[PDB]
Amino acid sequence: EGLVVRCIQRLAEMCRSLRGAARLVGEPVLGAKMETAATLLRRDIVFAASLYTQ
RNA sequence: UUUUUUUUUUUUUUUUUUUUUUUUUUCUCCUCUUUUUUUUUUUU
């Protein structure tokens, strides 16, 4: 479980980039399920990163 | 005996206004027959 988190943060970028395409076309049927996936993917272990973040 | 790297949720907020129910048409139009008109009066 070291490459799973990196695969996750690679997937979330393309799902964050499909919204701009659905908005460009004008088809929010997919642009809504991409927003739901984007909010359904964000966990807290992903953002842990380093020790002295803040 | 299968390594290394590929960032992410638009920036902004400390804008004035001194009025008053309604609202605006329809034309001139043959009234039939015992009458002058009776009348005081009293019991409410």
Minimum-distance nucleotide, CA of A39 to C1': B9
**Token pair listed for A47:** 């953002």
**Cα angle value A31/A34/A35 (rounded, 5°):** 90
Please give the method by which this entry was determined. cryo-EM
What CA–CA distance (Å, rounded) separates A32 from A38? 10
Amino acid at A8: I
Element (H, E) at A19: helix A4-25
Nucleotide closest to A6 measured between CA and C1'? B6
Distance A33 CA to B7 C1' (A): 24
- Give the distance, in angstroms, between residue A28 CA and nucleotide B35 C1': 104
Distance A22 CA to B35 C1' (A): 109
Cα–chain center distance at A2: 18
